[PDB]
Amino acid sequence: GRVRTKTVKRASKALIERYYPKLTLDFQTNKRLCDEIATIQSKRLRNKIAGYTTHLMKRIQKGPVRG
Amino acid sequence: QQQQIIKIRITLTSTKVKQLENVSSNIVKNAEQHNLVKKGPVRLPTKVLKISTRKTPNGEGSKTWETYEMRIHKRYIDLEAPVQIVKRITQITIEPGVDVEVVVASN
Amino acid sequence: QHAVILDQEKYDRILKEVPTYRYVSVSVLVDRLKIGGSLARIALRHLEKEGIIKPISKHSKQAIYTRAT
Amino acid sequence: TPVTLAKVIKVLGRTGSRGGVTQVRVEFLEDTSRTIVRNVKGPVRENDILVLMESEREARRLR
Amino acid sequence: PGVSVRDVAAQDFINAYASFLQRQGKLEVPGYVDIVKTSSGNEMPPQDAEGWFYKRAASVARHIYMRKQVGVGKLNKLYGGAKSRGVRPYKHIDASGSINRKVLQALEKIGIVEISPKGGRRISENGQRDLDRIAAQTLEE
Amino acid sequence: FTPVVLATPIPEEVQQAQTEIKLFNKWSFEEVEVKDASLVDYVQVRQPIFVAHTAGRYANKRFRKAQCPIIERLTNSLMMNGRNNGKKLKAVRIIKHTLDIINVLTDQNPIQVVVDAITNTGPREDTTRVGGGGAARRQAVDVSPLRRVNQAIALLTIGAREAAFRNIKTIAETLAEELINAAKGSSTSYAIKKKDELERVAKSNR
Amino acid sequence: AVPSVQTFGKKKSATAVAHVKAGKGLIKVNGSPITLVEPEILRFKVYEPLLLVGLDKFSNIDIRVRVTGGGHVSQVYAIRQAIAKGLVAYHQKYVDEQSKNELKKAFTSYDRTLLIADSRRPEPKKFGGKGARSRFQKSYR
Amino acid sequence: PGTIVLYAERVQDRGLSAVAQAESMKFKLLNGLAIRRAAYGVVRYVMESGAKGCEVVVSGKLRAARAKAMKFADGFLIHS
Amino acid sequence: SLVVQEQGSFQHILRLLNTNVDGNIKIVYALTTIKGVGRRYSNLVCKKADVDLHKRAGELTQEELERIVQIMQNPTHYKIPAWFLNRQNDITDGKDYHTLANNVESKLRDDLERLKKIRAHRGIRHFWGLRVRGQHTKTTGRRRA
RNA sequence: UUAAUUGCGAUAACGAACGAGACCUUAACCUACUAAAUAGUGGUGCUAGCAUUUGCUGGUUAUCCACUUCUUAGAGGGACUAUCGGUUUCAAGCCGAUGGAAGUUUGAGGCAAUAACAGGUCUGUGAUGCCCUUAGACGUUCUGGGCCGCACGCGCGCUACACUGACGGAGCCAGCGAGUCUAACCUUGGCCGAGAGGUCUUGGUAAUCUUGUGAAACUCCGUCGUGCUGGGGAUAGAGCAUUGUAAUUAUUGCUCUUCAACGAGGAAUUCCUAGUAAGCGCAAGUCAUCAGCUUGCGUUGAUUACGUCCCUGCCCUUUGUACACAC
Ligand SMILES: [Mg+2]
Ligand SMILES: [Mg+2]
Ligand SMILES: [Mg+2]
Ligand SMILES: [Mg+2]
Ligand SMILES: [Mg+2]
Numbered sequence A: 001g002r003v004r005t006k007t008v009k010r011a012s013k014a015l016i017e018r019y020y021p022k023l024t025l026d027f028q029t030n031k032r033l034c035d036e037i038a039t040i041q042s043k044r045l046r047n048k049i050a051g052y053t054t055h056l057m058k059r060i061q062k063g064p065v066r067g
Numbered sequence B: 001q002q003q004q005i006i007k008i009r010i011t012l013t014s015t016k017v018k019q020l021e022n023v024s025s026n027i028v029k030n031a032e033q034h035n036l037v038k039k040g041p042v043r044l045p046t047k048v049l050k051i052s053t054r055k056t057p058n059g060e061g062s063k064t065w066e067t068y069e070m071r072i073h074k075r076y077i078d079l080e081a082p083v084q085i086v087k088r089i090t091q092i093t094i095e096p097g098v099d100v101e102v103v104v105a106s107n
Numbered sequence C: 001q002h003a004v005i006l007d008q009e010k011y012d013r014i015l016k017e018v019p020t021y022r023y024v025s026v027s028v029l030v031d032r033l034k035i036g037g038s039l040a041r042i043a044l045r046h047l048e049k050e051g052i053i054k055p056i057s058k059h060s061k062q063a064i065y066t067r068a069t
Numbered sequence D: 001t002p003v004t005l006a007k008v009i010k011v012l013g014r015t016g017s018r019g020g021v022t023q024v025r026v027e028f029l030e031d032t033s034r035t036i037v038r039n040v041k042g043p044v045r046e047n048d049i050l051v052l053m054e055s056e057r058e059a060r061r062l063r
Numbered sequence E: 001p002g003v004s005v006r007d008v009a010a011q012d013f014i015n016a017y018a019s020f021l022q023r024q025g026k027l028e029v030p031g032y033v034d035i036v037k038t039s040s041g042n043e044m045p046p047q048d049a050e051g052w053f054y055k056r057a058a059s060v061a062r063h064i065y066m067r068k069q070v071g072v073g074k075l076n077k078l079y080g081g082a083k084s085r086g087v088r089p090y091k092h093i094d095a096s097g098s099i100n101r102k103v104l105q106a107l108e109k110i111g112i113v114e115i116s117p118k119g120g121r122r123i124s125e126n127g128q129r130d131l132d133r134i135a136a137q138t139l140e141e
Numbered sequence F: 001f002t003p004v005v006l007a008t009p010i011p012e013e014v015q016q017a018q019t020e021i022k023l024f025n026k027w028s029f030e031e032v033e034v035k036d037a038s039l040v041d042y043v044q045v046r047q048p049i050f051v052a053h054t055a056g057r058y059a060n061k062r063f064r065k066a067q068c069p070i071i072e073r074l075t076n077s078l079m080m081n082g083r084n085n086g087k088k089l090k091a092v093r094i095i096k097h098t099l100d101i102i103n104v105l106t107d108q109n110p111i112q113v114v115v116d117a118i119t120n121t122g123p124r125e126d127t128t129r130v131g132g133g134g135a136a137r138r139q140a141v142d143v144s145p146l147r148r149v150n151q152a153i154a155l156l157t158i159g160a161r162e163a164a165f166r167n168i169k170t171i172a173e174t175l176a177e178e179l180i181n182a183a184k185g186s187s188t189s190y191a192i193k194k195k196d197e198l199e200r201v202a203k204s205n206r
Numbered sequence G: 001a002v003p004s005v006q007t008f009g010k011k012k013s014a015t016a017v018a019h020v021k022a023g024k025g026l027i028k029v030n031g032s033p034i035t036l037v038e039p040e041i042l043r044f045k046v047y048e049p050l051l052l053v054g055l056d057k058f059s060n061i062d063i064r065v066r067v068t069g070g071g072h073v074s075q076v077y078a079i080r081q082a083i084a085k086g087l088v089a090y091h092q093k094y095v096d097e098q099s100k101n102e103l104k105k106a107f108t109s110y111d112r113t114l115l116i117a118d119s120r121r122p123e124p125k126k127f128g129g130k131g132a133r134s135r136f137q138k139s140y141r
Numbered sequence H: 001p002g003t004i005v006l007y008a009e010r011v012q013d014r015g016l017s018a019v020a021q022a023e024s025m026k027f028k029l030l031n032g033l034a035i036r037r038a039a040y041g042v043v044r045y046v047m048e049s050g051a052k053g054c055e056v057v058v059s060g061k062l063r064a065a066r067a068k069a070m071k072f073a074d075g076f077l078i079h080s
Numbered sequence I: 001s002l003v004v005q006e007q008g009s010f011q012h013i014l015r016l017l018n019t020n021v022d023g024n025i026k027i028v029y030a031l032t033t034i035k036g037v038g039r040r041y042s043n044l045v046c047k048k049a050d051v052d053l054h055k056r057a058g059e060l061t062q063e064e065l066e067r068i069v070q071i072m073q074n075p076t077h078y079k080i081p082a083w084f085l086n087r088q089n090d091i092t093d094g095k096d097y098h099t100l101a102n103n104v105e106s107k108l109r110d111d112l113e114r115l116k117k118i119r120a121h122r123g124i125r126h127f128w129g130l131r132v133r134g135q136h137t138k139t140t141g142r143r144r145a
Numbered sequence J: 001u002u003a004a005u006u007g008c009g010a011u012a013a014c015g016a017a018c019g020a021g022a023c024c025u026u027a028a029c030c031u032a033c034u035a036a037a038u039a040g041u042g043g044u045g046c047u048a049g050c051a052u053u054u055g056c057u058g059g060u061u062a063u064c065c066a067c068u069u070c071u072u073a074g075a076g077g078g079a080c081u082a083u084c085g086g087u088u089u090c091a092a093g094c095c096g097a098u099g100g101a102a103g104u105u106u107g108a109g110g111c112a113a114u115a116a117c118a119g120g121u122c123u124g125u126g127a128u129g130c131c132c133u134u135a136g137a138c139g140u141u142c143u144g145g146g147c148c149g150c151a152c153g154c155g156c157g158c159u160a161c162a163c164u165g166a167c168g169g170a171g172c173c174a175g176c177g178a179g180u181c182u183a184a185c186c187u188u189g190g191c192c193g194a195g196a197g198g199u200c201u202u203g204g205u206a207a208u209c210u211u212g213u214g215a216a217a218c219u220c221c222g223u224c225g226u227g228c229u230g231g232g233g234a235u236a237g238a239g240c241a242u243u244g245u246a247a248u249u250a251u252u253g254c255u256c257u258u259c260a261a262c263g264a265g266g267a268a269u270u271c272c273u274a275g276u277a278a279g280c281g282c283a284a285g286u287c288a289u290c291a292g293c294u295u296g297c298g299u300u301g302a303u304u305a306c307g308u309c310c311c312u313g314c315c316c317u318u319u320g321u322a323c324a325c326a327c
């Protein structure tokens, strides 16, 4: 039951594409930088975005990603 | 009437902690800038009022039980100053929803 | 069904048989003798102050007793 | 009667009408390379070890 | 070798001290004892006869020493239990007020419990003399 | 080894427990190896514990109760049937009495005896009512080693409960009667017969 | 001047504060010693912090303990917890970490609840049933 | 007397006042004006006052004995 | 507080006011077999007679038995504050009585007989076999009582 | 695959909205900020007690110092499944170890879409249309009864049938609430009485007083020993008090005593997956008193499975229809 809404996924995909040099493979820095490069109305929602983004980009280190 | 310490105690309760925090932080900072001897704010255990009631105006339906709440925060702030200096900043700018209770201590 | 008082034809059986019992309880005495519960209850109370068997555990409602030596 | 041991390898899936039964693929630690599937009731994991009375019977209730 | 009433189990502490009161023989029982059940939650009176008042006194005597000031109401609550109220469910029923008050009054005559102007009844200077002496007894045999 | 002088004088019987992590004060946790295969890794050994009563978070997952200690496992299965739901203090004292009684006889390791008993009385082959209806057939199924142990622990308890119900007997000795009967193997106890009934029905409808 | 620590230990409703500081090997819990905790079957349930690390690590410390809240066995879990953390926090600040560390690995390997509170918390009941998840017995007839 | 006083003032941005619209819906219908006509009138003004969305629900029998309830909506409405 | 052993100077079951007291049981709960006497009324009078509670009503003496029967018919003369008897403040004389075993029915029938005579709602309920204490009989106590 | 039309994917659809989620409240942590005599702690200005050579406790905060560890509430920090391993079309995800206060949507609720029901409510309303009644009233009030009447059938409940026990003495720990000057509310303590209870004083408009609601279950020791027995208190006669103007149809509480079925319950059937089921009581609602009821709160705390369509219900797709007021 960990399937995320499109709001988490779309924001995570949009964020990483235009900010890949800014992001880093660590979640603690990713959630910290997200507070200034995006406006999120809840820390729980912001963590879900940063939790998926640090999950998407480990797979970026493993070959390509479609989309 | 020349710097007569009176042991003045102010008690504040409300229902909106957002509005209550505005008033409490003002008297506290007012005494801080007037370098009083200040007993910092003490927040009482926020009392909660419960009324459970059946949703149905009739008796027909599944046994559903709603319950409403009121939240009663409470603070008491004690100040140490002459009567004249503190009465000018207490009679005015009282934000609504905060019933002010100023009392005098004789301890 | 079961005896209720103590007499010599029942007392000598108690003395001659209780040694070499590995385990003695209120019910075991009621099973292996004609004594009742309280008669069994004064059994484990009495014969230990004669020291014939050794106490390992002491608890109300439950006899935990072992033959001495 | 020669009771024999068996050791689970793959939990092939859950079966039975009510979901109780399981089909697991077991192996024999004595007289190895004999692999048979069995219809098992309780919870089970990988590398699990169990006991079988007989080896001359496959697991039937599949799919 | 300092021994207060803290270093003996409360089971054999009361048994010794009630037996200390047994040989003392001047506890001033009120005379209507050995017949009352001491609680509506109790359906038959206390089984012991010769020393149950000594049991009640000694158990209570610990309570004032443990606590600060205790009226009859606290001791009334403490020793009451659950009442079989019949075909209806159980409920805590307060115990008897006549005995435990007189138990306090009886122990007042000994010189153990004061009048405690800050509440109910409190310990005395002579209150813990026998207590700590019996406590000194109960640890070392 | 040598006595240590503390301002709180701790009794000698309890202070010696540090030299070997035993049970309460008397019984050990060594040589508890299981004579019967397929039940090792599914009965808790080599986790020394001081008590049969713990606040054990063991049901939140699928197999956390597999690591639940077996002397706690039997206490929890005992504390049931309406008038004994809850009250684990009743369960821990009953086994405290039962472990005393069981070592009164048969001087060997008490945990080894119940380990022998749980191996002996575990439903070895169970039936399954294949087909979704009353007019159906039973089919014999090899039982899981956990399910063998988990069910049979209740078979020790349900036998002693029947023995202790409306009888002169008490539950501690009847339990200590039920563990010694299962460990030996007699078909005299309740648990072995109920295990045997499941086997005899199973062989008929393989 | 005198070195001391003070740690807490909480359960479903119980709590316990213990002050670990230099002494001569004293344990005291509400006045009565650790040997006099209640009941007799749960006496030993608090000795594991002593038994795992040894009385040899208690030579030069005295322990004062208070416990409140919850129910009878819940305090015993709370008493054994704040005692365990009290020693660990004491040996951290004034002794080398390995003494604290050896305590930590020993306690965690046996029972993690000595240094960690049990996060299992009660679930409130819901209308339509006396339990948190249990429901009223409907009929359909 | 004198311990209670009144200051009457005017609500700004009237189109965002759900209560104030309700009587203007009530007053238009009490004259004889068409229920469809008034409900379209109120939502257009509310929407043009900067609102993200407005929903107007009239319920009750209308020109037929068997009562029917109909809605009138615009913009974005959320419910949870 | 001491424990004393016992010896079998026994006598078996005997009658007691036409109510055969059951033997082999403790005296207080043996006197519960006496009608109109409960666990309370047996415990107190046995303590009055100075008898040990652990006599088991089998190794007793006739001298103690003739003492307690006097306490049976005449209880107020053995230090009771008279709130402890079976029939408090009776109708016939205003005196507190303790009707003994055999005749509880006689004062029970006479009580209903008076209620039958007075033609009160209670007495009419008794003759009809209904519930007198206001208990509902619509769907409870249907076939019996 | 998910709890989810939740997502990945395939793809004549693409881009969206509502709903789900997100959100909010509440429980779980913080030796890091703010503090506190309406909370607690340690020392001690001032002292006090004993067993003693130092442990606990009466205490005092311009009749002392310091602080938030615990209690509290403001600001935050914290979890997003985190790292790794396994597996999947190597995607969405699921399993396990470890670390962590916490890894079942973190636990639970509040809200919750379109369309609908001839569902229920005219007995909440001075929300309301039509009909009826309107002076001998279906309007309003007073007295008494009835709603509780009792051959019977059915539903929700409490007490049990005993030793995993009852009884007696002892040990003896909670949390959520409520409480009167807009007057007789929560009540402490003293006195008297077996008890219920009576009387006098006392604190509290309430983190202060009831209150630490010293609840019960539970724990220690003794009485009972399988006997419808001391399990069971139904039923019934007496007396004693309280609330009420009134307790009779027993309002209820207390004491003696009377002492039934009930020996685990046919067909059939109810709810429930971890601080959960169950046991146990407590607080509030109603209320002058009456709970066997409900809503919450705490105490003790199981068994069993991480699955399926076998029954039951619902939903979807295909298909048939002479149904559409829709079997
Ligand atoms: Mg939505
Ligand atoms: Mg929710
Ligand atoms: Mg209809
Ligand atoms: Mg509380
Ligand atoms: Mg109701």
Ligand SMILES: [Mg+2]
Binding pocket: J320
């Ligand atoms: Mg066709």
